[PDB]
């Protein structure tokens, strides 16, 4: 599956100094994030229940499963050896996609 590229390896914009990356996670689609001094990630919306009451997001480092519900739209995701990221999502029912605010300030390269 081919992923839609968001960000650049030579740029720090959107990942440093209280800034975030806005992503649109399509069902049966993939999104790839790139940043200076940060590991390359793969964001994918795996499962969506009828509602949409439950959104399954899988984060894979170049996976870890995160659950997004209307009650709990924001979650801190731990990626062992790579630090953390925050998925501040906007669930607006079964539209086939999920809009997320990704905060990659606490992310780091393993080495």
């Amino acid at each position, epitope marked *: 599956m081919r992923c839609v590229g968001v960000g650049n390896r030579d740029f720090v914009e959107g990942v440093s100094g209280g800034a975030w990356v806005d992503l649109v996670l399509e069902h049966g689609g993939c999104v790839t994030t790139m940043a200076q001094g940060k590991p390359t990630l793969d964001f994918e919306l795996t499962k969506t229940t009828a509602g949409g009451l439950e959104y399954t997001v899988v984060v894979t480092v170049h996976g*870890v*499963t*995160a*659950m*997004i*519900t209307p009650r*709990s739209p924001s*979650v*801190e*995701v*731990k990626l*062992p*050896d790579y*630090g*953390e990221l*925050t998925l501040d999502c906007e669930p607006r029912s079964g539209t086939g996609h999920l809009k997320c605010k990704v905060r990659m*300030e*606490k992310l780091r390269i*393993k080495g």
Partner: antibody
Framework: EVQLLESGPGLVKPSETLSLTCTVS????????WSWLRQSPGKGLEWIGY???????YYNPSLKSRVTISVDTSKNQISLRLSAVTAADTALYYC?????????????????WGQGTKVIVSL | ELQMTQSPSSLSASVGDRVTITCRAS??????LNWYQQKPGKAPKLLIY???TLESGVPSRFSGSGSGTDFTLTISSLQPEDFATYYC?????????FGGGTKVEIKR
């Protein structure tokens, strides 16, 4: 104000499953990462693993095949399940909050701890 | 797993003395190290995080230093309540590992 109350049997027979409960008081269980640790006078302080209500759990590779840590939002409690138990699993078990960038004191530090539960594996 | 070595295992000291607890890592862990205090019958209590940052409520006598592999915990002037077992914990790589601990006993 968030408090951790530890529960479970003090004596477990060998080959059985070790079940312990950590109840959260005066706060929301959903917002934090919950960890389980153990201490013995020869193996020292050992990190078993962590669990989150909406994020997939991560365990120590030395216990991964036998350990399960679950977060129950409705019951407001965290459970620790250790199968195929032996005398080597006899330790003082602790339930703690694993800090993040916004929650706890700092990322991957244990600020809030349980009272501790003495678990003896014997027939 | 990432091995953490604490030296000495046992330390005999007097009240008012300057005590230094060492913690050595097998790999470079940057400043990703935390310090804990454990008294008999009680759970471990966090003192210092991020190698040098002091936790709120912890007295000024407790100090943290080091980067990479070599790390130190310093109690400038030892108080009667400070007699406990001190542990160092890394968080650079998983699984999260703790040191063997340093038991601070009263010299006589």
């Amino acid at each position: 104000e968030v408090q951790l109350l530890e529960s479970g049997p003090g004596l477990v027979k060998p080959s059985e499953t070790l079940s312990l409960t950590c109840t959260v008081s005066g706060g929301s269980i959903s917002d934090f990462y919950w960890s389980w640790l153990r201490q013995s006078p020869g193996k020292g302080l050992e990190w078993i693993g962590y669990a989150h209500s909406r994020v997939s759990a991560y365990y120590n590779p030395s216990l991964k095949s036998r350990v399960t840590i679950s977060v129950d939002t409705s019951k407001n409690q965290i459970s620790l399940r250790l199968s195929a138990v032996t005398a080597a699993d006899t330790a003082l078990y602790y339930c703690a909050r694993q800090g993040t960038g916004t929650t706890g004191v700092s990322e991957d530090s244990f600020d809030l701890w349980g009272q501790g539960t003495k678990v003896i594996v014997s027939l | 797993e990432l091995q953490m070595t604490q030296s000495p295992s046992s330390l005999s000291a007097s009240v008012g003395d300057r005590v230094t607890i060492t913690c050595r890592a097998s790999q470079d862990i940057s400043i990703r190290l935390n310090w804990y205090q454990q008294k008999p019958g009680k759970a471990p209590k966090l003192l210092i995080y991020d190698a040098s940052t002091l936790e709120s409520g912890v007295p000024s006598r407790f100090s943290g230093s080091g980067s990479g592999t070599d790390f130190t915990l310093t109690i400038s002037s030892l108080q009667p309540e400070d007699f406990a077992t001190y542990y160092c914990q890394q968080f650079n790589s998983y699984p999260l590992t703790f040191g063997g601990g340093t038991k601070v006993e009263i010299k006589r």
